[PDB]
RNA sequence: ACUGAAACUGUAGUAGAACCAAUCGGGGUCGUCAAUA
């Protein structure tokens, strides 16, 4: 089945990425913005630079240069798990327990988490 | 019912001044998929 509402519709227009120079939120000013939908960009007011490691032997060679630990499974996020990614309110409150999956992206008064 | 002759369209003059190839982005991470018996 398909849920009835697309997740973009469960996000408020004031929380979506900014579409114009006048709707720049704090991080869009501090870190800057480029409009993904048209003209409009802003150079960020915050620049990170001069990263230096202090420790010379900072890297854990696990024993030999050829050793390698196999690293769990980093799976892809699956927002289809509406009980994990969907919120019962635009306050971000979780879905209620015990309801069937169709409850998920179900009403416009639902929110994203 | 006696051709005028002779005469450099040339001389001077910087396609140039100003303009940031640049703005935003963690090499990141979980549950789905199939439909019957």
Distances from the Cα of A58 to the Cαs of A54, A55, A61, in angstroms? 8, 5, 9
Q: Which two tokens stand for residue A77?
A: 């996020």
Resolution stated for this PDB structure, in Å = 2.8
Strand B proximal residues, A:12-41, Cβ < 7 Å: 31-34, 41
Q: Which two tokens stand for residue A80?
A: 């289809």
Q: Which nucleotides of B are covered by protein (CB under 7 A)?
A: 22-25, 28-33
Q: What is the CA radius of gyration of chain A?
A: 21
Q: Mark out the alpha helices in A1-113 (DSSP H runs).
A: 26-30, 82-85
List A79's β-bridge partners, or say none: none
Decide the pairing of beta strands A86-87 and A41-43. Answer: unpaired
Structure determination method: cryo-EM
The nucleotide lying nearest A36 (C-alpha to C1') is B24
- Assign A35 to helix, strand or coil: coil
């Amino acid at each position: 089945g398909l849920y009835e509402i697309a997740p973009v519709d469960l996000l408020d227009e004031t929380l979506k990425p900014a579409t114009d120079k006048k709707q720049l939120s704090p991080a869009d000013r501090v870190f800057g913005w480029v409009n993904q939908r048209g003209n409009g960009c802003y150079k960020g007011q915050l620049r990170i630079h001069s990263v230096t490691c202090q420790h010379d032997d900072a890297i854990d060679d696990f024993g030999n240069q050829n050793f390698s630990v196999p690293l769990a499974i980093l799976g892809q996020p699956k927002p289809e798990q509406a009980r994990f990614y969907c919120a019962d309110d635009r306050k971000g409150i979780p879905l209620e327990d015990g309801y069937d999956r169709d409850d998920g992206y179900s009403d416009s008064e639902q929110g994203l988490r």
